[PDB]
Each structure stands twice: as C-alpha cells, then as structure tokens.
Paper text:
Here, we report a noncanonical FAD-dependent enzyme Orf1 that adds a glycine-derived N-formimidoyl group to glycinothricin to form the antibiotic BD-12. X-ray crystallography was used to investigate this complex enzymatic process, which showed Orf1 has two substrate-binding sites that sit 13.5 Å apart unlike canonical FAD-dependent oxidoreductases. One site could accommodate glycine and the other glycinothricin or glycylthricin. The resultant product is no longer sensitive to aminoglycoside-modifying enzymes, a strategy that antibiotic-producing species employ to counter drug resistance in competing species.
The residues nearby the C281-adduct include T298, E312, E313, F316 and E426, of which F316, E312 and E313 may cooperatively allow nucleophilic addition and cofactor-free decarboxylation reactions to proceed in sequence. Our reasoning is that F316 stabilizes the planar imine glycine adduct through the π-π stacking interaction. The importance of this residue was ascertained by mutational experiments, whereby F316A brings on 6 as the major product (Fig. 2a (vi)). On the other hand, superposition of the F316A-ST-F and C281-adduct complex displays that the long side chain of ST-F is subject to a geographic effect, resulting in flipping of the amide group away from E312 to accommodate the entire aliphatic sidechain. This posture is somewhat unexpected as the ε-amine of the β-lysine is a bit extended away from the α-carbon of the oximinoacetate adduct likely due to the absence of the phenyl ring (F316A). E312 not only recognizes the streptolidine base but also ushers the β-lysine to crawl into the binding site in a compact manner. In this context, E312A is able to catalyze the formation of 5 and 6 but no more 8, as opposed to F316A, which catalyzes the formation of 8, the dominant product (Fig. 2a (v), d (ix, x)). The enzymatic reactions in the presence of ST-F (compound 7) alongside glycine or isotopically labeled glycine suggested that the product is N-iminoacetyl-ST-F (compound 8). On the other hand, given ST-F the reaction gives rise to N-iminoacetyl glycinthricin, where the terminal carboxylic group is retained and the N–O bond undergoes dehydration afterwards.
Numbering used by the authors:
A (entry chain C), C (entry chain B), D (entry chain A): 10 to 491
B (entry chain D): 13 to 491
Write the structure that this text describes.
C-alpha cells in the first residue's frame, strides 16, 4: 500500500496526521488511539509554548542541549500560522487555542540558588543570544499575583511572544483539522507492528484486526519504544522511553479572574517546575510535578498534589487557597533514557518514530511534524534533528562528573523547594554523604553510559532487580553499538 | 408514604417503614448523583465515644445527644446482619473495623485536644465501655513523623466503622426487597392544606399523593419545609457543614485493623483513617459551615487533610495514589442539635440536622420516627430534638465566645503554625472584642455555636443582616 | 563663669566637647559621665556611617524626613577630615577608627514586601537624586556572604563611600582628642541643672558637689529630656525622649575572616534592621534590635538575642552559627516622642541640648557638634537644623492615617521577619483585627498629636496608668503651645 | 605533718579538699586553682542532683552503665547531711545551697521517639526497680510551665527527693568549709607534676614556684589527663579526657517567679538536654548544651545560645522570651574517651585522680570525695568504684554495632530536637546514607576500641590529622595493655 497509519492520538500523532493528510491528499492516513488517552501527556498539559522558559544552565552547557534549544526557538516561529491553519477549520464557538501571548518568569527564594539563580541567568543569556523581545520588569508591575511575602519574587522577566495554548482545544482543533483534510480516526490501539524483509506491512489492533500500510508513524508517547522494540534487533537500537509522570490541576478561581500572561519559574528539581497557564471561563491551570517511573502510573500521589498546591498558593496567588479544585490531571511525559527525543526514520522501510519529547513535545509539535513529513517525502526535513534519530547508540551529552554534580544539586533542591527548615550545618552534611552513594551507583550501572539526574534518582531508589535489569540493558546496548 | 431523601437517614427510615408496615406503599425520592450528599463522603466511623468533647458534655443537650449515640451502637450488629441478609458474598461487607484507637499528639490546641482526650476517657469510664489506654508503641501500622507523633493512645473495643458506599447499596437493596419503590427525582414542594400533608411536587413536574411525608433531605431539609405556612420561624435552619475526605490506594495494599482518629478539632473537623477492603483507605475529614451549599473541595481543604494524615498517621500515605476527593454537606443545625420527629402539620415528619453522627445514629433515629408514625412514643430521650421548636440555647453566650476564640486559635495550632511566641496572646486579645460585638449585634437572646459564628463573622454584611432578621422573627414567633 | 559643662560621654557629648575645646582654647570645658556608660547607645553601636542605608519610603514621604536625610548626606562629607583630626592625637598602636569604606544593601524575602521592597526602591531613588556613586550588582558578586538559600538575597546595591567606624576606637579617640584640646574628664553624673533669672549657674553631681558654668550642653542620650524637664515649664516644652533599647553582639568568626564592606538590609519592623560591621582582629559586629521602652532597660531579652542571631546566621553567613560569642551589647537609642532630634539652644541662657538622634546620632555627630558650637559662638550653624531646635511644640510630620497604616504594616512585618509559617488566610485576618484597636488608641491619646509607629506599639502594650499619664502629657503640651 | 596538694578548684577538688582537711588532722592540704575557673564545669552547672533524671535506655543496657547508676543513687543519700555540714560553717547571709527537693521529667514530641520515648520508659523502670518515691502526673498539674502548645508535654513524671543546688553557693560553701578546717587556698595553676623513683615529689606552679608534697590529687576537670600524661608511660595508661563544652544561662524572669521543682527532659542528642533549675531572688538557670571538642573552648557558639533559648522558651515557659538575660555560662564537662570516670589511685605513689565525671560529677561529689579519702587512708572506700580506677585499658562498655546504631539515632535526633520541618521521605534517606560513613570511621579508628557516639560524631567532623592522631593513640593504648 501507500496507506499511512499514525499510532497515537496525542499532540504529536495528530500534528503529523494533519501534516500528512494536508500535503499528500492522494494517500489514506488512518490515526489510532482511544478518547480516554490513557497516560496521555497532552491532555494533562497547560500548555506553555516553552522555548526560553525551558532554558537551564545544565542544558545549555552541552552541545545536545544547545541543539534541543535551537529547535524550540525554531518551533516558536511556526505557532502563529499553525494556530491560524487549525482555527480556520472551525468557528468562534469552538473556543480559542491561544490562551496567552506572553510569559513572566519569576525568581523567588523557594528553591536552590544552584538551580534557580543559575537558570534565571541562563534564560536571560538565551534571550539575548536569540534577539528575543524581553524585559526584566519590576515585580510590582506583574499583574494579578498575590504571593505570601516570604515566598514572593524579587525579580521578574517578561518574555514577549512566548505564550500558552489550551491543550484540550488544541486536541479538538487537530482532530477537526485532520478530518477536514481527509484523515480517518480509528479509535483502537495498535498491539503490534508487522514487518518482514526489512519493510513495514501494517499494524495489528487490540480488536484483533490487521490494517495494511506502506508507512507506520509511532507517536504513542511513553509506549513508543516498547511497541518498536518487538521488531528484530531494535530492542538495543531504539533508546528506552520511561514515564515522566506529571500532576497538574484545573482550579475555578475565587473571583473568576486569571493572569493575562503565563506565570512560571525556571525548571526545578528533577525537571518539575511551577507555572500557571490562563484558561477561558474563570478556570486556571496549575502545574506541574515530574517523577520518572520505571512503570506507568495513572494516579497522582498525595505528595505530588500537596507540593503542586502548596507552591502555587504561596508563590503565585494566596487566593487559589480558597478556590475550587475542579480536576487533578495525570499524564506521562515520554522520558528518553539518554535525555533526548527520538524523531525520524528507522532501519525498517516505512517505519517512523516521533517520541521521547519529555517536557516540550507539544511546543515542538509543528516543527517535528514537518520534519517527519519532509523525510517521508524523500526530503531532509529540518537541520539539527539528525543527532535525535530514533535508531542510535545512547547519547552521552554530559560527563559522569557533570551528572553526579547535577544529581546531588537536584537532591538538595527537593529540600530548598519544599521549603524545609533545618539546622544550618545539616545541608552541607547531607551534600557530603550523598556524593559517595551516587558515584557508586553510576560506576556500577555501566563503564560508558550515565543516566541523566532525573532517571538516576529513580534508579537509586528502585528495587535491586530493576537496577540489575538496567545494568543488563546498558551492557546489551554497548554490545550492539561497539 | 413518601420519604424525601436518599442518604442514610431517608433509606434507613424507608427500610424500617417498608419492613414493619407491609400493607402501605413507601416511595423514596432522590437521585443517584446524591448532590451535596453527606453519606457517600463519610468513612464512616460508628462514633459514640470518639465524638465526645468537653464542650458537648458540659451541656445537658450534649449529654442527651451522647446518650443516644451510646444507645445506637447496640443496634448496629443486628442492623448490619438484617441488611447483608438481603444480598450475597459478592455485595461486600458493611463492617470494615470493630475497634477504634484515639491518638493524642501535640499538632493542635491543648484547650481542645487535652480537654477532649480527658472527656473521652471520662465518658468511657461512666458508660462502663470496654477500653484501655495503651502504649503508642503497641499501635499497629501507624508511621507518623516523630515531631507529629502521639504520646497517648486509647483502644475503644466495639466502636468500629462501616463502608458508607456498601451501606447505601445494602439499604437500597433491603428497601426494594421489603416492597419499597425508588423514584429517582427530587421533591420541589411539599403540598399541604387544612393542616395536613397531601403529597409532593417533583422536579419532573409530577405530583405524588401521600398521607405521610418524611423529609430526610440532609442540608436541604429545613429549606423544603420552610415554604409551608408559619414553619419558616418554627423549624430551626440547617446549613451545609461542607466536608472533604479522600480514598487512597496504599503504597503496599495494607491498612490498619482499627479506625485511627483524633478527638474533634477546630470548628468540628477532625483527623481519622477508616479501613476499606481491597487495599484502599478512607481519610477524613474537613468541616466548614457555609451559608450556601458547595459541591467542590477548596485547595486549602485538600492540603490540610493530606498534610495531617501523612504527618500524624502514616508517612507512607505520601507515596500512596489518590483515587477520589469526596465532598458532602453535614446537615448543620443553627442551634447545634438534630431535628427528629413530628410537625404541627399532620403526616409531616423530619429526620435531619445530625451534623457529624447521623449515620451512626441512623438505626435508632429510623426506629424512633417509625414508632411515632405508628402512634408509639419511640425512644425516650429524643423529645428535646423535636423539629418544631424555639432555637435551643445549650450554652451561655460567655461559654460560646470562649469556645469561638479557642477554636480560632486551634486553626493555627492544628496547621501547625510557627510564630513568634508573643503573637498567639496578641491574636487572642484582639479576637475577643470583635466576636463579643458580633454576638451582641446578632440577637439579645440567641447565640450561634462557634462553628456557625465563625462562618457568620466572615460572611457578607447582607448575610449577617438577614440572620439578625431571622433571629428577631424566631423570637417574635416563640415569645 | 565662661566655663562649659558637657553632660554625657557618648559620641554627641564627646564630639561637642572636642569642638568647644578646640575652638575656644580660652574657656575650661568639663565633660561628665562614667566609664560604665549605663544605657549608652554609642558603645553598643557598630557603627555604620548610614546616610543612604537609613532611607525609608515612609521617612522620605515627609518634609521633616527629607530634611533629616539632607543633614545625613552633609555629615558624610565631614567624616574623612574628622577621623584624621582624631587619629592625629594618637599613635599606630591606638588602632584605626574607619573599618570599611563601602556598604552593600541586600534584599531578601525574610520580611514584609510593604517595608523591604518599598525601602529598597526608596534607597535607589535617594542615591539617584543625590548623584551618589552606587551600582546595583549581582548577588553572586557580593564577597564573603554564605546565606541559607531559602533566606538569600536576590538583589544587592553597592554604595561607595558609605562605610563604618569602630564605635569603641571612636570613643577612645574622642576622649584622647578632648584631653589634647584642654578638656577635663570628670567621671560623675549630673543629678540637677541649676538655673535662676533664666540663666544656667551650673550642675549638681551625684557625689554631692556643685560645678559652676555659664554653659551646660546636655548630651545624656535617652536621659537628656528627663534632666532638663526639672527646670521651670520645660516639662511640656522639651519633647520627651524614650529608650530605643538595642541589642548587638561581637563575634569571633570561625576562620578570623570578615567582609570588606558593611552588609545591611534597609530598616525593618519598628526601626530595627540587620547588619554586619567589619572589625579588626578576626571579630565582626552584628546588629541590631530595637524596642521602644517607656522605662530604661540595660539587659537583652532572650527574644532579642535569638532574633538577632537567627537573622544574621540565615541571611548573612551560616558560618556565624559556629562562631564564638564574645559579647552581647545593650544600649538605648534616644527615641524622641515626635520622631526628630533635639539639637540647639533653649529659652534658658547658656542651656544647650544634643539628643533624640535615635538610629543615626553617631553618623551625624561631626555636623551636629559644629552646628551647636557655631550657635554658642553667635553664628547660625548648619542650615536646616533650625526645625530640630529642642524647645518646640511636638512635630506632626505625618497624618494620623499615615501612622495607623504604618503601625499595622510594621506589626505584620514582625511576623514576616521571623519568618513565621501560618495558614494563608491568617495574615489578612490579623490585619483586619489590628486596625480597630490602633485607631481607638490613637483617638484616645490626643485630638492633635499622634506618636510614630515605634512609640505607638510600645504605648499599645503598656499599662493603663502609663497610657493615662501620656494622655495627660499630650494635653499639657497642647495647653503650653496653643 | 605530711603535705597534700589538690590540683583543681571545681566541686571534686574542693569536695576532696574539705574531706581530707576535716578527717586528717595530721595532713596540711593546699588546693590550687584560680577564681576565674577557666573552662570550669561546676560554675556553669545548675545544678540538678540527677540520679534517675540521668537514666537512659542505652546507659542501663551496659554493665558499666548500671554500675555508674547505682553510685548516683548512693550519692543522693549523702546530700542532706553534706549540705548541713557545709552551711554550718556560714550564716543566713551566705544563702541556701539547696534550691529544690523534687524534679518533674516532661515528655514532649520535640525530639526523636528513639531517644525520648525509650528514655522516659527507662527512667520509669529504674524508679520502679529502686523503689524510689515517684508518680506519673497529669501535665495540667505541673505548676508554672507555659509551653507553646505545639511544643507541650503530654506526659510528666514527679520524682520525690531528687532536687537541685545552687552551684555558686555550693562552691562558696566548699571554699569557706575548706578554710574553716585548716585548708590553704593557693590561687595558681599546676604546670607540672614532678615524680621520680615512681613517687610524687610535688607540683611546679605557673608563677614558677615548686610546692613539695607526698600526695597530689588531680581534680583539674577536662585538663586532668593532659596534666598526668607528661609522667612516664601514663600517656597510654590514663584514658584521655576531652571537653564536653556546655552552654547554660541565668535569666531574671519577667515577674520574679520560678518553678518549685526542677523541670527537665531526659538526656537528648549527644548528651545534651533541656532543664530549668530554680534559683533564689527572681533568677532561673536554664541548660544545657553539650558538644565534645578535641580542644578546649571557653566561649558559647551562636548555635548553642539559640538552641538553648529556643528549647526553653517553647518547651518550658514562653514568658522566658521576654525575660532578661543576665549571663551566658560556658564550662567543660570532663568527657572520658571510654565513657566512664577516672577515680582513685595510680601506679605513681601518692598520685590520685578525680575526673572524667562528664554530666554528674557534681551530683556524685560527696560519694567520690569519701571514696578517694578512704583510699588515701588505707581503706577500700566505696564498693563498685574499682572498675573506674584511673589507670586502665580503655573500657569497651558496648559493642561496635550498639554504638553505630546509637550515633545514627543521635544524629537524626539533632534534626527532630531542632525541630526541623522536612519532606517526609528525607529522614529515611538521611538514615540510610549516614550508616555507611559511621561504620567506615569506626572500622578505620581501631580493630578493638570504639568511641561512644558523643565522641564519634566529634571525630567524624574533625580534621584528617586529628583522626590520624587518634588512630595512633588507640594503637599505642592497645600496645601498652596487650
Ligand atoms: C466528610 C464527612 C464525613 C462523615 N463521617 C461520618 C462518620 O465518620 N460517622 C458518622 O456517623 N457520620 C459521618 N458523616 C455523616 C453524618 O453522620 C451526617 O449527618 C449524615 O450522613 C446525614 O445523613 P442524611 O441522610 O441526613 O443526609 P445526606 O447523606 O445528605 O442525604 C440527603 C440526600 O437527599 C438528597 N436530596 C436533597 N434534596 C432533595 C430533594 N429535594 N428531593 C430528594 N432528595 C433530595 C441529597 O442529594 C442526598 O442524597 C460524615 C459526613 C461527611 C460530609
Ligand atoms: C553546662 C553544664 C551543666 C551541668 N549540669 C550539671 C548538673 O545538672 N548536675 C551535675 O551533677 N553536674 C552538672 N554539671 C557538671 C558535671 O557534674 C561535671 O562533671 C563536674 O562539675 C566536674 O567537676 P570537676 O570539679 O571535676 O571539674 P571543674 O568543675 O571543671 O573544675 C576543675 C577546675 O580546675 C581548674 N584547673 C584546670 N587546670 C588546672 C591546673 N593546672 N591547676 C589548677 N587548677 C586547674 C579549672 O580552672 C577549674 O576551676 C554540669 C556541667 C556543665 C558544663
């Protein structure tokens, strides 16, 4: 066939489905996935069109991090026309995809100086280098916020043209745009990709059916590598993707008000962060926790709910304390084991992957969709996505020393972000006693690969059998690629 | 007979009527959504001794309410047997625990927690209830933060818990088995004339005729009857004691063998864990008196419930999965006591205003009202709690003003806050004047209990003025 | 006689004694006061040469406040030659009066936004208006500091040429300079100023002696008005001076190090503040608490010691935690009831006053000394110190409404500066319940006079009899002047 | 007659001096030490006549601990007649040695359950086994206390006949009683004990003099072993004594009141504890911190002052917050390296030691004095003090496993006693990461000796060179005794 099957109905699957359907009107594109969107990252997202807000000192200190940042800056330029093209298929009554145009990044002292101070400086530097319009503003000039004075910001950065979308209205607009362009929605899950003679034949679905295709695009979020790893050799050639389990909430504000901009901190301990995304109709979105889990989890923990609520009420608006909780949302950020996305072609003809985007796949979606569609048409797509090809040796973007410094810093940051109150000698004591055990873990896991801090903490506190299984995985990957 | 309401009280009275008068047709109103419903949000504890406070037992009305709770406990074993008998193994067990441990920690006000622990011990000794003060080290399962840990623990034997959801399912099943009819609509209006009930207009526009109407509509019960001539100032108002609770799947599927609880805390909230089947635990429960109904938890309520349970009961709950946040309205009577029995309108009955322990008292209250409807005298000590009455004044204005300041300070100590050491005394001195001024302004004769007085203090001027008018109209009607 | 008696041996008494002795070599000047310096402000002082560091929004919102600030800026220019003139009378072995040239003002969130944010902006504005050399600098560039990250500064302001002196070396240099200029030190206290026919005759001392004089200069710190109030009518003509009881400490640092600059916050709740003043020999000075007391107190409270130590260890340097406490110091800032100093002549011929300087008499001392000496010589002294003449109706520098707003703000700031951790509804509840009782107190005390916030809180929590005595005092002042 | 020199003027030196002078009319006794009492434990002590109040589960789990406890119970019986015999040499105007007859032990949650709950049970058990008069009482029945409700006791234990003395009045009474009995006070320090042919000749003093004697009793507190270690072989034969540096304070209460009983907790992290000892004249004593230091320290750290004040104001009486600080006191508890006292004779003829009594030498003083005086007269003194002879191999009273469990428990207790506020997973994480490094230190120090927890934490955080010097010391002790 020349038929295309997109496996997955998040932002990435639907974005690539829309681009394929619009640019190849001669081909039949079928998109799989159920309206429940189990473990789905996209429906749990605010979401911020985060490019500069996602900048950390640690990310920009590596070549792979600077490459990822460059792609985020490129994606931002596509959003205005992308939104126009999606709203064009609907009417006023469908709601607006865009919920804010601008972002304010706040700097408070409810966190580690080694993350928050370093990251604020890195955001300012990235904005200056990219010639992005921005201004450091008086905190008194930030509208709406009403923090606890002991939790208040002392610096604020207004980023112009870095905004937010309603993730639910975006998903509805993508489905509507996909159908308008001739796409077919088949609400079942793929169980298996069938291939032989190094070529895709199609997909077995969970209702027992077989769908033939010349092209299969896997955009199944955190399930994407588990689906492809079934094919010969690919188990140690496609980097593993884990569940970056994230908790967010929809709140009806006490007075129906909301801020005119996104409000956020820089990224905090183990890739969580605090933000408020404006919504229509007297609602605000607050996010968002992150915990890398070696198995999927579809429910918030008590700890996650309390940390999210406590940070938002103290650092953003005390009025949220008296506001009504409408929904606790949980989704899995696709967390790649080497810290970088899996975008492009495979050694299997007609097999494509769009996954492992962690915190900013939704932001990057229009760029990633256009990249993969260009490749499927025999083009070279977007420059700078080559290192993020899905079939690869694990990337080592940092030295083991850089990661060990990072994991101790992030561990200490879980204290400062709480925020804890301890005797003044205790933090230095904890730092000195954390270094040895993390160094020992890193040395034991592999002679060549080091997991990024977010994954390393999850491994440190996992069962012995899960640790031993990872040592075996790293050894098998090393064997395959060396 | 029409029963208006499908909580524990409506269904309990429906079951008793259907079982004891097989000759009469009983129809029970209410929707499966159970909007603002207290019963489905309840754990629930069969709380008699666990509900004891020094303040309650210092009043005659409080001691009378406590006596009825002790009496109700004796009915539960045969009541549960009679409800499970209409089902099979697959329906699950109503009883989830036989015993309760009351814990005393320092995450609260000495003026509430220390006084209330002593009052519970005294009530157990006076009632000859089986109990013993035990070593905290001997309490199984708990894993508190050491800075939030109990230093005293009290094991109460035969004071247990039921699964409120399995109880509601068992009551509906038992009601149908006894010939009851479930009509899933709400009453909009009780029709009466010549001082006699004719029946009920429903929200699908229909009219249902009846000689008897039993109102058990929880926090909506008085608003429904107040439409009838004169009754607006003769049936004490019932407000929403909005309560937040949660179902949690524990990290390891374990749970305690007993109820774990504190005594009642600031403005009639309290901390407890109720065992459930299938690796779930129930944690509760917040309380906030609202002058209007609210069906959603506030952020503050969720955080306080979770923070107290994780620190004071089990730190493992921190890593446990949140399955459900539950919200319900405890029917909060304006004079602090329930509304149980007959009316000046022939065939009009009320079962409401039970606040924290209607579910516990349900088998006793059901049998009381069914006896009255049969021309009996029901249960001896329920006469003062007749629904058509002047507002009860169970405490002096001075006792209530002391209580409201104590409870206000307890919201700090229960957080728990960390303040400069002069600040609490400063807050106490500056709280006394404004609460005394509010109490004096509201009425020359009536004083709302502390739980309601704080809600009135922080309500709009117009809501305060409407209450002054209500109290004046009640005084006019009864004096 | 043409003899001069200076009553008091603090910075003001000794500074005026030195200037009189140096400029009238024909007259005998005797200076009274004991080496114990009971309740003495000067020996408890760091001290900061604070002009811009003392700026608050509230002070600069009044004409009297702007006038006081102008005089502080003028005093700064006299310090270099004043220090030269004092060290000239000694040798290398006497040690250096100046301990730092520059000041860094730090902004953290361990306080009320309504004080700390407003005051930081006011300091920046005062520096810009005066064309003073200064720079807002990166907190990372502030040397030596090692704060708790949850208590850390996010903004820092370097003020050039605003420094510090060792108060003990200054007092020793002033005594030595006074003797070099022909002054006589008589270590007894004045019990009584004798006057008749509207003219000073001299001073009865506490050893029962009588010293004759044509001139008596009262610089007895917080005792100054109580001494002069004995003279006919002067009880209701010289504004009362109360004890601004201040606690400070000398600490030997863990490693003998100290910062190269003064480190300070702006003034905080009820005119306290946090600062570190460099000292020679591996010592640092930390200060300083403030509590207005209606009666003198010569000992620190436990609360004062804990608040001073807790703030310095968290907000400046955690290493101070392990440092050795050498001395807890207590002194009475002369706190004038109308908020302004008492400098110049009296209706009694030859009777002069130098007092009521509260937080910055030591800084202003060379200017105030030269002013009073000019007046004693028939000059007009320094322009703008005429409004601060000691014999006056009480100044009303602010509206009752401004003071009631200030006293509630400062009350709440005692919480935020602790810092407390409270349920988020409690602060607004406390603010609403504080307003009524402070308004009631202000209305009860007088129809015309309102005490500044620092004094109003002391009166609020004083005995009924002390309140009633103040109502009588205000009534008697009103009678005398209207 | 025959000369005796007592080296040291604390409770032990003066108690033995009084007993010798009273009982030995044949002997001339001279007692050395200065009125400054540098590093002196006794003047910094409250002091509690602590027998049952000093009970811990850990102490009573060892044979040596139970033996030490038995001696404390015996000492209590001597105090009434001892006090009579000392007050008899004075008049009413000298003041009363006894300040309280009874003690209340309070149990609150501002500490580790593994110390405070275990120790409360151990105190109850020791009282029941001894048939001591006591009762567990309602906290509401404890007079005077006004704790923060979040810091309040929930259990209280009244111990009858376990009281307190004023340490300053005791020292004055001992000096007066010593002089009345013919003792000579020579206010110089010993620099050197001279011996040859295995016999004491006398003492070189720090004024360069030599005093001849047949008998030298060393009771120089924490300096006792350093003084004798100069003599041949004795460096590895007299267990080292370190400085258990303790901070306490005298406070004038807001209203002149005080409690009628001692108020105390059981012993807390690394042998500190919280207590209030009644004093006459509107003063109370609060104590007391403890930190084992490898070198003497004569000044309180900021941390010590804050922890003492914070615990007393929260857990005992909030009124202490507004009370006046009269004195911060610092003294060195003589801390023996093997955890037990050094009482009795030496291999050097006429050389005796009374030291290493740590927390309860003052309580035991009448018993210890009578023991040593009996031995010096050719008696056998008190049964059960033989195991505490000063010339010995280091005692090993606990297994390495017991001490490693204890040191981790005590480390965690420094957090719970603060009290800290941390995320709920942090304590378990700290416990797991503390175990390895303490086990490694214990293994490195010696194959045979393990320092008790109080000393082990001091060694853990000492310089590498101090650790290496201790490894050498332990090796040299092993060589000498095996
Ligand atoms: C968080 C929480 C915890 C609790 N824990 C306990 C506990 O541990 N122990 C205990 O004994 N009790 C507990 N209770 C409940 C307490 O006992 C209540 O007083 C009791 O449940 C009230 O029962 P009810 O049947 O009167 O009211 P509800 O349970 O409110 O039932 C009233 C019903 O009437 C319906 N209704 C309303 N208007 C109409 C209408 N017009 N027509 C028809 N139907 C209508 C409502 O939708 C609702 O379903 C708890 C309650 C809450 C909220
Ligand atoms: C804060 C604190 C609280 C305490 N609380 C209690 C309590 O409640 N109950 C209790 O029973 N005990 C208490 N103690 C004391 C404890 O019992 C001690 O073990 C005991 O006081 C030790 O007495 P000592 O005479 O051996 O030593 P010290 O009291 O130290 O006396 C030794 C003396 O010898 C002098 N000296 C040193 N070197 C020389 C030299 N070369 N020549 C001459 N003199 C020299 C020193 O200057 C000093 O005065 C406390 C101690 C401290 C520090």
């Amino acid at each position: 066939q020349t038929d295309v099957i997109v496996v997955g109905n998040g932002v990435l699957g639907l974005s690539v489905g829309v681009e394929i359907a619009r640019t190849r009107p001669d081909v039949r594109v079928t998109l799989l996935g159920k309206p429940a969107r189990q473990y789905g990252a996209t429906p749990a997202a605010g979401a911020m069109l985060g490019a500069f807000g996602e900048v950390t000192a640690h990310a920009l200190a590596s070549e792979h991090g600077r490459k990822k940042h460059a792609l985020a800056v490129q994606a931002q330029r596509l959003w205005p026309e992308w939104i126009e093209s999606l709203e064009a298929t609907g009417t006023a009554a469908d709601g607006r995809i865009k919920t804010a145009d601008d972002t304010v990044v706040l700097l408070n002292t409810v966190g580690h100086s080694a993350l928050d101070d370093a990251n604020f400086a890195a955001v300012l530097t990235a904005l200056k280098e990219a010639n992005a319009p921005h201004e450091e503003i008086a905190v008194e000039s930030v509208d709406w916020i009403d923090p606890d004075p002991n939790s208040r910001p002392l610096r604020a950065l207004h980023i112009e043209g870095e905004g937010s979308v309603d993730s639910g209205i975006l998903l509805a607009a993508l489905e509507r745009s996909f159908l308008q362009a001739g796409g077919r929605l088949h609400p079942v899950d793929a169980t298996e990709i069938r291939a032989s003679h190094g070529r895709v034949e199609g997909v077995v679905t969970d209702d027992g059916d077989f769908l033939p295709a010349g092209h299969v695009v896997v955009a199944a979020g955190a399930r994407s590598q588990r689906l492809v790893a079934a094919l010969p050799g690919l188990a140690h050639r496609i980097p593993r993707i884990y569940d970056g389990v994230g908790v967010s909430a929809l709140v009806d504000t006490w007075d129906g008000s909301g801020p005119a901009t996104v409000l956020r901190t820089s990224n905090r301990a183990f890739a969580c962060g605090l933000h408020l995304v404006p919504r229509a109709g007297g609602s605000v979105y607050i996010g968002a926790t992150n915990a890398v889990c070696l198995e999927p989890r579809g429910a918030a923990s008590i700890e996650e709910t309390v940390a999210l609520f406590n940070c938002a009420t103290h650092q953003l608006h005390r009025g949220l304390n008296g506001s009504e909780l409408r929904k606790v949302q949980v989704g899995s950020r696709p967390a790649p084991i080497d810290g970088f996305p899996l975008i492009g072609g495979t050694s299997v003809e007609g097999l494509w992957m769009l996954s492992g985007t962690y915190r900013d796949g939704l932001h990057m979606s229009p760029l990633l969709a256009r990249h993969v569609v260009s490749l499927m048409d025999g083009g070279t797509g977007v420059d700078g996505l080559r290192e993020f090809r899905p079939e690869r040796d694990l990337i080592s973007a940092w030295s083991r020393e850089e990661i060990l410094d990072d994991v101790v810093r992030h561990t200490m940051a879980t204290g400062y972000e709480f925020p804890w109150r301890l005797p003044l000698e205790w933090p230095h004591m904890m730092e000195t006693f954390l270094q040895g055990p993390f160094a020992e873990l890193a040395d034991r896991l592999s002679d060549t690969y080091t997991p990024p801090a977010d994954l390393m903490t999850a491994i440190m506190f996992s069962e012995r059998e899960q640790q031993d299984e990872l040592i075996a995985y790293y050894a098998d990957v090393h064997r395959e690629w060396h």
